[model samples]
Target chain A: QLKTPKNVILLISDGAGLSQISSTFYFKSGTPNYTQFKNIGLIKTSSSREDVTDSASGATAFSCGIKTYNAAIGVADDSTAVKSIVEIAALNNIKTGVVATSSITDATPASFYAHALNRGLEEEIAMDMTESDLDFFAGGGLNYFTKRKDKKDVLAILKGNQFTINTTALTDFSSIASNRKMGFLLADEAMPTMEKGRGNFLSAATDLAIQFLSKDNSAFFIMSEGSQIDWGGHANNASYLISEINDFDDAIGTALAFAKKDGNTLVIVTSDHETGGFTLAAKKNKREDGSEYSDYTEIGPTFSTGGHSATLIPVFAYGPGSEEFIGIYENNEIFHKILKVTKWNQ
Target chain B: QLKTPKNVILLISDGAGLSQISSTFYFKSGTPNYTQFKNIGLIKTSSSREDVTDSASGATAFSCGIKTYNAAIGVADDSTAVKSIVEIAALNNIKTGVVATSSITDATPASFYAHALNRGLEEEIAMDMTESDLDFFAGGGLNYFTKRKDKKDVLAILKGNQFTINTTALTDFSSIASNRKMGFLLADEAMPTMEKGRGNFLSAATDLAIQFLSKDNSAFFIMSEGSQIDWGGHANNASYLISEINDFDDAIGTALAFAKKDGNTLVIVTSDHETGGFTLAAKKNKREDGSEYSDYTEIGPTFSTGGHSATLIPVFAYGPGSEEFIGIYENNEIFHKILKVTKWNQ
Candidate 1:
């Protein structure tokens, strides 16, 4: 006897593991929004061909319910295009949106609205966006739509397909028409890191998408990603990783706050896979014999690998039907669970 | 509304974190018993004095519902003895058992039935066990009980108090009477490592204790521990760590199978804290300049520290009242939650 959810918010913090998530508890100013969750689960994120997954295969597992090979976007292992959650939601008359700190045509966000054999086809991904059923989208990558190598004006094509595009700031809800489809390309490439004063872009975009999609109390599905956490891990920068995850924590607070008030919105927060083999180790001290030992009073973050690892990722859930996500499962099961709980694919 | 549990089994895997737990999914021969659990929570394991906790303070947090300084055993921050669950359950006429691979006077098991200002007081801890309310106990520590520095024969005193002690092996339930108190000291100190043929001692002792304590349909509380996992982590030996956790997983299966059939038992599994700063990284490969790069096809276990870390530990529970263990909280809350759910304190 579970309550059905009218809306769903799926937040993906790319390249984070338990150690990366544990940093929020130590580094954040106050209690993390993660502390507010009562239902938690773990997921295995290996791709069909690789022991460790890439960003494209990880997002494809959520956008389309399949274990595709690494670098495949919205396609199965055999390179066949699959029906995405956005398309299914369109048929069910549910508004859909996507937001990320990376480019709009990046592997994570592109998987929701585009199909490509490889994640490198940014121009192709942008062209596919013109044909997608997505109602709202916001991120970087204006270059992909306007300055293509083929000299094609994709922004004009999107305008012709009923999209109200914005290249500047996120406008207020009253400034835009309720019925018009929305698009925002805020940068030429990926957004700046949190250390570079990205401020509250992630949370702001998430809040804006929710407001725009649910204008008339309409049901919606939105996927927002903290994309730069993965970039910081790749660089093996502890300060960068901590700052990015802290920003992601704010976005989670925004989602949980709205879900608590609305009572019908389901919120799930998780990661694709772990990167850099990140660890929160005890601070190091040298012995008289030149051997190293640990000091428990302080922390010293360390890294092992520059690429992803095949570790299980944690999942946190709240609101209606959140109990469905309380067990270990394959990464692709998230797509099925969303459809089962919302009945949007019925 | 949740159902009340008649019996409780608390299993502790010392010094294991998420990466150590994830190793089971990759290295174990079959599906891990950890997947059977649905209710999961995270715990912050910092001590009141140190940012990172040692085993004594960590176990005391579970035995006594307070956050003490590092090295404190079954005592508050002021070094005063606190009531343990075993003592409280004895007042309520409930049978209690304690088992571990380490010595019976080790930090973890000692915290349950003995109070000491520090974990180093092993002989004193063993003496306190003679007056403890524990009905059944199995582990090493024959030396501390027989060959003490103070030249006291604690074993004779245990026998004088209606106890049947076994120093050779874990005997069958029928060989010992249902009414007799039982004790087993299988090794001189800590038991042999799994690689050295420790075999199924952990699971066997756990199964035997459940049978002995629950005789005549009595309600019981048992704490079983995988103690050597911490030692392996301290040594930076991945094989030792994995094998020990595999054996610990067998004990979890034993507890879970009985809980499922009995339908009135609650099984909780967790750890004191993380050790070794363990990470399951991608295999390393060298470039032309001898710089290392990651190959995602294989796993290379890595470590960053030789001591415990402040990383959050995971908690998994099953059966009636298991839902109460969900959500993020301080490690000491475990004692309070167990008492709240079982109502033994009332």
Candidate 2:
């Protein structure tokens, strides 16, 4: 017996496993917003063709309800286009949006509104977004739309397709209050890392999208990503990873705060897979010139791999219809669960 | 909003965090029993004195609902004895049993029935067990009772207290059918590792105990431990850890099978803390004696340290009252949640 939610906010912390999530409790200044969640689930995140998953296949699993190959975006195992959650939401007269710290044309956000044989086709993904039914979107990829290899002016195409484009910064909701669709490109590529002062861009953009989408009491679905968490893991930089996850936690807080007020919104926070075999190990203590022993009072966060691992990722849900996510499942099942709970595909 | 349960089964896999649990999904032959759970939770396992907790404090938190210092067994931070869940259940007229792969006097099993200043006081813990309210017990540690420094015959004491003890093997329920109390000491010290052919002992003993306790439709509580998983992590042996978790998974399956049938039993599986900083990383390959590169097709399990880590542990729950364990909390809260759901203290 699950209640249907009027809105769904899917916040993907790219490359965060249980250990990466555990970092919030240790490094964050206050209690993490993750503690506010009750219904938790674990997802087996292997791609269809590989034991370890890449961002493209992982996001495609969430967006399209299918397990594709490592680099496939919004497509099946045979490279055929699939209907995504955003597409189904639009069909049900529900508003849709996507926000990420990475380029809007990147694999994760791209999978929501575009289909491609490979995630590397950023220019083609940018073109596909012009034809999408998304009512709002935010993040980077100014260069992909304006300075392209094919000499195609996607910015002009977006303007022609009724998009109120803002290339410099995110404006207040009133600036685009009357617009049918809105777009923001805050960086030439991926946004600045949290260590480089990305500020509240992730949470702020999410809050703005929620306000704009629900302005007319419309049902909506939004995908907000902390995309650079994966990049930090790939770099094997613990401080970089921690800062990115901390930013993601704030975004989760923003969504949960809104869901608590709205009463009919479902907020789900999860990861595509675990990046960097991160562990909060006991800090090593060294003598004046002798061998080291562990200090159990402190922590020395350590990594075992520079790439993603095949461990299961945790999913957390709150608000209406959250109880549907209270069990172990494949990553792609998230899409079906969302549709089943909202009945958006009907 | 949660159901009350008549029976509770708390299964602790010593020194396992998410990655250690993830091994069952990748390495086990069948679907791990973990997937059978619908409600899940996360636990913060820090002791009062250390960020990284030892087995004694971790188990004491579960047993006595207190944040004691590391190495303390069934005691508060000031070294005062606390009431354990087993004692509370016994006072509430619930039959109780404990089974483990370690010595019966080990920190985990000892926390259930014995009150000691430190976990190393095995002889004292064995002596304390004679004054306990335990209805059934099984594991190793014949030496603690027989080969004592004080030369006290604990075997004779146990016999005078109306006990039917077995030192050779786990016998059928009918063999101990007429006894008021049952005990089994299967080894001189800790039991054999799973790789050394400790076949089915954990799950078998648990099953037998469940049968013996519930033969008269008596409500019961049990604590079954896969203790050597921590030992495997300390030794940094991946295969040993995997085999131990695999055995733990079987024990969970046994408990779940009974819970699903009983309809009023709550089954919870969690860990004290993580050990070995283990990760299922990508396989490293050398191309014709060249520099090594990662092969994402396979896993090469690795470790960052040979000690416990401060990562949060996962909790999986099923049956009635399972929903109460559906969020992040301090490890000690588990005892409170059990008591709140069962009303054992009332």
Candidate 3:
């Protein structure tokens, strides 16, 4: 058996695929770097009733380790009664952090901690986050918490709980300390794709998360997401997707560097599901003699907006227990496996 | 330093990008099995001369580590006077093999062993392979040697040297012992893409290469090229490109499994360069707005025939020397580094 990783960091590129990841390496950063994940497993993202998966259900499956209906976060069914590994980790006093380029209440990150019938219950979810005992929640979607018309500001709730809330421009993230819990909102919506977010918001969030979370000396679970890659896929914007994925990849790089130094961390990077049904099509022009282009374009966001496909997503894992994720498995199984490795259930 | 991989297998998915790799994962195989390469570097591919890279020079830079002018293969300049790592390995008695879905003489595979002013010199290169001390050469492009109208048939030359040549339509390659030096040609030009080559031809080549090369009791170098992927990129055919990449990935699986069993193997998976200047743009219809099908289409190839762009490519290495290739380095450095680790220069 391969040596098991002691500390585990789960990095999620929300809607990233092999092609999307590759595109990011080229067009965005001028080089492809997200190639360190070697213990790989292809994950099927098919849901119970649909050929495609939505963010809510996809996140629920990955976070809770069971298939659920679309648009349902935290709940396994209409029953709304599933326990996530995040909650389990918190219950055990294990340090936990959820970071995203999207709002903290977004479907992918929120599904790991908050339980709600509707993923759009961002305001409610934000309030739930304030009440949860998680060590960190850093990302965009501040409007859902600070600008609620009902006057129930979750950011204020977080502040009152003694949590350090950093909602300044992207640069303010660098000042955070490791001992304090943090909540950062760098933009109104999802942070710009890495290409557009050249100001370094994601990297700052990652560094801050690592500094704070690593101090616990206990095993940590950090979910860092490149949320805008999905948006790029949805928009069919190849450049944006590549840039954002690379940006997310840079955060991954920072995390991996930290893990390497610590030597006890386990890193699992995966996607909830592949969006856009993307394909690297043929070159634009073929010679009259039938010769073709040596290179091709991976068409981004050609089909379907705002939902996941039944496509099998790529799971790139490193560190301890990385071997377990290899081969074909359902998306939900990932949650069970991670929890199992962490001994959260035991 | 990480444990030295007892065996090393380098799988090159030529011209494979995100869209191409994922579309195949979704459409044909229902799942992609080679997602274990997420932990490495993710870089973009932009040609030094243009926004896109052509096949010959793109692959040449990837294999030889320096970007040359378009239509150039292996040579760093018009002089055509550089030796690839394969040559160095041959001099050191390290068993080497080159397999591809395209003709053995195609850019992706040829760049590793054959340096020429033009990739069109397939016949001459075929003769060179027949004379070289390398152990194995497989996958299509037999016409370059077998049916040449000019000099003596290349196969006769190989046969004169006691080389076992396999060219039959229904030969059982799996039964061959590892002690044999073999040359196989499965198709005429490029083999069909993964969507087209449903059988185990590529994997068979990988399996056979390992079986035979392992008998030498020395470190081995194998290059498995998914050459048709570049073709898929040129056609901008998403489905086909994905299948081709996935097919190549399966070959990696075969190689990695062998390396895992051997324990000392190093498996390096990388692209020579980004063929298509791919990008994942934006999301069109939000689920909130109810739109299906993410409208992705080619924006138009920048080069007349989608030439090589100086985009950053992806390089993934596992085994003893894997750590040495981390971070940013010129592609040619890969050759220098690999040779350095193997002590081939000594």
Candidate 4:
């Protein structure tokens, strides 16, 4: 008999494809949390209208279980609003939260609760957050909520909507009241890079969210993003990419720890799409005669493009009902697999 | 409650990376056989002494479940001969076979039944094959066995040991008697590429292996390799790579077809390591000869270094003990995992 899960944690490493994930093994000092997973799958990340997918469409696939255009968020291809896994969970009286290294209103996090015609409408996305039934949320983009071009103080609206907003740091899960929702906005846009003293913020915020959302023994769903790996890929900055994914792996360890102990939680980790066309080639070296040959003792991470690649990304899962997540499928199947494993129908 | 498999078939696609596998989704006509599998894992392919591994060490790890230095074949890091799965399977009364598109004495196939200090010792490797417990074999290395500098004809010795050699073509499985051992060396070296009409050779040879090894209701194990994908990667030839992998996928379909019906067979498909640092970047085009945007409708396959890359490879499995193969693992764990699941011991 298949075991049912009480919680589902979808961890997305934006632009962190197989090569990006491969970095943890070489650049980091320890075994990656990826090694702990038992059920793994691969996903084809093409958008409905394009061969290559952007973050918005990829996230919408996971959140709403439908194929959409490259920049559409929480909507179908015809521009119809699609109820997300968040909304469906809320209907089942299950709590939901989102944690990201990027701004909460970024394409990935926004797609879970905010329906928009385009991902560029960040202010509109912030507006939608105030109406979302999300129990806990964290990450940057404070300016979008408070200093909007529309002259609307969306943070104030969120405060009026029963959200206890924190701007400096993640609040302790025990510090919040049962009736008050939690929100954390720590930066003007995306959070600082890991090299910039963004110490443990990604993992810390995820830990906080998991604690807060599962406080009342309620079923919960949380989506956490290691968002900055994509930025590093865009810049072709090897250290930036490596450090961010190292942090993401650490956060994965956090989720895996919780899921293993709970036994009833299904933890899934995947990527939106490959960025930078990253390849971990053999390091180049010259011998005494000035002839060049690949040095197998080290690796030279290389990139082929500055944008997203169409390669399929991997999926890793653990805990109860993780088996359903194994296999090759479209990106949108993630949403269906989660609902099927949890027996929570929309 | 896991079901134990009565047979195991391991299909290796040499040099096929995630990017190489991704090509089937776009470059091929229909859904890939890879999608049929529901159990998947990723393998770390680093050798004992180097950050990157060659096929010799890689296959030795799978064959012996021991980490060896690069270029080592069927030996541990200290140059000690290690008993392989074929040797152990024979002791347990399980029938065994091997099929490859490369010479039977090539590094990947040689690791199964031959132990040597380096992969270059093909003559010695060929000598080891005559003494191996392998009941059935089919590949392209006749010269290594017949025209060795050591002034010894290993093929004549194999004939002396109750072996039936077929150099013309694959014999019908029904035509070959079970008592007479089968060997096919259709070429003096590696087989021709798929573009050159190496039609159905891999799948047909593997089908013949399965049929011959299982004739007496005996538990069987077979290792089949699509060896030319790595050769194409070494040459950085996309068409050659794509065509060869498509052929490999067909062979995978053959293995899967049998595994599905047998219900007691485990089929695992994976690669030793990635080669060519392959990338599926967005198709490059210009709108007005100076356009800044990329066309997202197509993909342009690209390559980095010509040698092997350190990226982890994927593992796909199906059938009774398929779930046991799910997880991130050391490449050597494949042998242990197989033995653990099948309870095969020395």
i-RMS, each model, one decimal: 1.3, 0.8, 9.4, 1.0
| Maximum-TM-score candidate | 2
Give the true-structure RMSD of model 1. Answer: 1.7
Candidate 2 has an interface RMSD (Å) of 0.8
lDDT by residue for model 1 over B52-128, one digit each (tens)? 88999999999888899888999999999999989998998899999999999999999999999999999999989
Q: Which stretches of candidate 4 lie over 4 Å from their true place?
A: A288-291, B287-293
Docking class of 4: medium
TM-score of chain B of each: 0.98, 0.98, 0.83, 0.97
**Which of candidates 1 and 2 is the stronger one according to TM-score?**
2
Poorly placed runs, candidate 1 (over 4 Å): A177-179, A287-291, B285-292
Per-model TM-score, in order, reads 0.97, 0.98, 0.71, 0.96
True contacts kept of each: 0.65, 0.77, 0.02, 0.83
Q: All models: lDDT?
A: 0.91, 0.93, 0.67, 0.91
Distance from true position, residue B283, model 2, in Å?
Answer: 2.0
Please give the TM-score of chain B in predicted model 4: 0.97
Cα misplacement distance, residue B289 of candidate 1 (Å): 7.5
TM-score result, candidate 2: 0.98
The window of 10 residues in a row where model 1 chain A has the poorest summed lDDT is A170-179
